[PDB]
Amino acid sequence: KVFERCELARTLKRLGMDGYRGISLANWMCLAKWESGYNTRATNYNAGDRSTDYGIFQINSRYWCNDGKTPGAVRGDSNACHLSCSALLQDNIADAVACAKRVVRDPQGIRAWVAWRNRCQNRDVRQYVQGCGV
Ligand SMILES: [Cl-]
Ligand SMILES: [Cl-]
């Protein structure tokens, strides 16, 4: 599904993302925008290390979900969200949101995504939620 900007904002709000681990809703919006253009079926294979990024938040298979084809995480957690990567391609984003919450529970928080640093950090990100009623 390709979400409309305000439709997503309202969904994320209901899902409890505003201020989750200190991250404002506008930040999550900025991230979804640059990671997938608000598309839940987006997938990006990383030829470089053989991992794949899945869904609206472009969550990586090396650590967060199981796709069976990614060369492990030696021994650490290679499926920290306890999900099949397929779960991150559904139209319903409940699973992707719960996994994104797990990602930010690690020390790097939102910095885990390079796109957030490049396109959202230290920027005026109010634009992403303006007039959505959230
Ligand atoms: Cl699953
Ligand atoms: Cl699985």
Method: X-ray
Report resolution (Å) to 1 decimal.
1.8
Residue 106 CA to residue 133 CA, distance in Å, equals 30
| Sequence letter at residue 8 | L
35 is a catalytic site residue: yes
Q: No. of H helices and E strands in the chain?
A: 4, 3
List Cα–Cα distances, 118 to 15, 110, 112, in angstroms: 26, 12, 12
Alpha-carbon torsion, ordered 42, 86, 120, 76, to 10 deg: -140
**Cα–Cα distance between 22 and 18 in angstroms, integer?**
8
DSSP string, 104-117: HTSTTGGGGSHHHH
Please name each of the domains of the chain with its CATH number.
1-134 (1.10.530.10)
Rounded distance from Cα 103 to ligand 1 centre (Å) = 16
**Residue 114: φ, ψ to 5°:** -65, -35
CB 36 within 8 A of CB 55: yes
Question: In angstroms, what is the span from residue 26 Cα to ligand 2's centroid?
Answer: 31
| Contact of 41 with 89, CB cutoff 8 Å | yes
Closest by Cα among 56, 63, 28 to 42? 56
CA distance 120 to 30: 6
What is the 88 CA–ligand 1 centroid distance (Å)? 8
